[PDB]
Amino acid sequence: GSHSMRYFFTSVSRPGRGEPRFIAVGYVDDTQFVRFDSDAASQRMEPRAPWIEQEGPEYWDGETRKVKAHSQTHRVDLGTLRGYYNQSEAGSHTVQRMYGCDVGSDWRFLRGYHQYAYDGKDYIALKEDLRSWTAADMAAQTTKHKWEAAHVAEQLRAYLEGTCVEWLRRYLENGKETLQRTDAPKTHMTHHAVSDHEATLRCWALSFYPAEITLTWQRDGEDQTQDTELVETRPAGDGTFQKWAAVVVPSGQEQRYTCHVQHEGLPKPLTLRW
């Protein structure tokens, strides 16, 4: 199975008073491990997972100095963009930025990302090849020209194919007790009564990691999308996740309906039945 390391950055301008709010968070897979908030006393990158606290003081200074520099970059970006798009300083604006690497099943580099959004719209993205850019409009074209001339893709390749995969592998190592342990979903089925002739089966998948999951209803072997609700996958709050699907069926016919479950912590898939 493949692994990932992602840093998510957000700067929101504050036109009323002061500088922009900058929040940064770091993940290995679906597990948060670092945070920075400019609205905290700390002013340090903080840990959010037990495995990362192994890392000595030079790591933490290192990450704080960097995370603080990214804040300053994004402050300026909020300004530049404001000028590109001719906006006033009355309004509050948001810059987002995400970047990271994946390793394959083979524990080598698979993909790198490095992409930006403005006011929640795609702005400028680094492509799969890590040698070209997708600019969404003529403001991001301005950014693109700069970045071609300046050999920016080349610099982010060194990181995405090098340092980034190195540290992902280090973390997955030091944190293997949890990070390389898949929790299979604890499943069970529940049964409500919409009417005398109509009842609702529901299929629950609880306390599973990672979040990736598929729940599918089958009537008499055939997949059935009709008469089914579902919820988006949701965090349990303890680092695991929850999801359910439900189907509406004739009372008495619940033996026909089965719930299939694919989760990368399950060798064979599962089949519940009422």
């Binding site: 530049t80 300046a150 060194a158 540290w167």
Partner: peptide
């Protein structure tokens, strides 16, 4: 590990 490289400006 955040990118040590001076980040690019838009």
């Amino acid at each position: 590990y955040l990118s040590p490289i001076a980040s690019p400006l838009l």
